[PDB]
Write a protein that binds this ligand. Structure first.
Ligand SMILES: *CCC(=O)N1[C@@H]2CC[C@H]1C[C@@H](n1nc(-c3ccc(Oc4ccc5c(c4)ncn5C)c(C)c3)c3c(C)ncnc31)C2
Ligand SMILES: [Cl-]
Length: 308
């Protein structure tokens, strides 16, 4: 990890938003050098609370230097603290898995879908091992490094800021209701078992080629819907065996939901005989991986880890 000077970073375009901040595609030019390194920069939104502390690098570094040892979860390469807090990581070149499945639909294979499910479970299992509750797992937060390598991103900030998302009014009151466990919606309780609920929704997004969960149902009606027992429907390509795992992730009793270590072993087992568990149908050409680097100068590095 490095402390970056503001002259080292340049934002080149906005990529999108998530809790607490906006993500930009940027260029990192290490101080004193000429090489250009594509990065993603999350800029935290300013805290609008009048009673908030008006006031460092050490405090932020201590909180964000966590979970740096899995292939399946992102890690920061640097921070830059000035008037704003900038968190910097390698840019994942193929974007998010949500866009990938939406663009490829029926060109996908069962083996790829189950492999991604197993890698996401591996990343979450690692986050559970390092005692870091994610709070916002969704397919938009699963990034594509290469076709056979995905990484979970965007975690650690609620506990850095010691702030419930709903009380960070700079986020405009938006929360990912349709991915959240009931206890997170009603009581703002987040645990590794509520992450398991979000994992089930993420698997559902992948197996529907990126459908929107509960499409057409207003977020305000979701708690009543769940309390009455209604759940997301069976994706057409999923056997009942795979759908049963998703239903277990959505039980109101959080202790009865699967554990990530068991999800890793179940999806590794299914990924070894994929056509027995996922059947992509005629109703649903090679897949295209769309690059976030397609407009970058060829001399720029492709991955910050190449940098010495
Ligand atoms: C396809 C989906 C999509 O277009 N988007 C989703 C949501 C909005 C856009 C941006 C895209 N995206 N985000 C990041 C990313 C996310 C978080 C982040 O901040 C942290 C903070 C702490 C942290 C992190 C990451 N990893 C570990 N720890 C402790 C950053 C800096 C960046 C993307 C990246 C890195 N590459 C590509 N696309 C990204 C997701
Ligand atoms: Cl239950």
């Amino acid at each position: 990890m490095r402390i970056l000077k503001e002259t080292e970073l340049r934002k080149v375009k906005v990529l999108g938003s998530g809790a607490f901040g906006t993500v930009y595609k940027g260029i990192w030019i290490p101080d004193g050098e000429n090489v250009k390194i594509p990065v993603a920069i999350k800029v935290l939104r300013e805290n609008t609370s009048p009673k908030a502390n008006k006031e460092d690098e050490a405090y932020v570094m201590a909180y964000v230097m966590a979970g740096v040892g899995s292939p399946y979860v992102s890690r920061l390469l640097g921070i830059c603290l000035t008037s704003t807090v900038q968190l910097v990581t390698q840019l994942m070149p193929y974007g998010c898995l949500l866009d990938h499945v939406r663009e490829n639909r029926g060109r996908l294979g069962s083996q790829d879908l189950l492999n991604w499910c197993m890698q996401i479970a591996k990343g979450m299992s690692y986050l559970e091992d390092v005692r870091l509750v994610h709070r916002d797992l969704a397919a938009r937060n699963v990034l594509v490094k290469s076709p056979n390598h995905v990484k979970i991103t965007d975690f650690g900030l609620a506990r850095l800021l010691d702030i419930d998302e709903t009380e960070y009014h700079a986020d405009g009151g938006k929360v990912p209701i349709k991915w959240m466990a009931l206890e997170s919606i009603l009581r703002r309780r987040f645990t590794h078992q509520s992450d398991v609920w979000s994992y089930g929704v993420t698997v559902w997004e992948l197996m529907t080629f990126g459908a929107k969960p509960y499409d057409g149902i207003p977020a305000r009606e979701i708690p009543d819907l769940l309390e009455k027992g209604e759940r997301l429907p069976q994706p057409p390509i999923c056997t009942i065996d795979v759908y049963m795992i998703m239903v277990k992730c959505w039980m109101i009793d959080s202790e009865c939901r699967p554990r990530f270590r068991e999800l890793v072993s179940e999806f590794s087992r299914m990924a070894r005989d994929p056509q027995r568990f996922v059947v992509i149908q005629n109703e649903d050409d090679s897949t295209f991986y769309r690059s976030l680097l397609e407009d970058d100068d060829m001399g720029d590095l492709v991955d910050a880890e190449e940098y010495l």
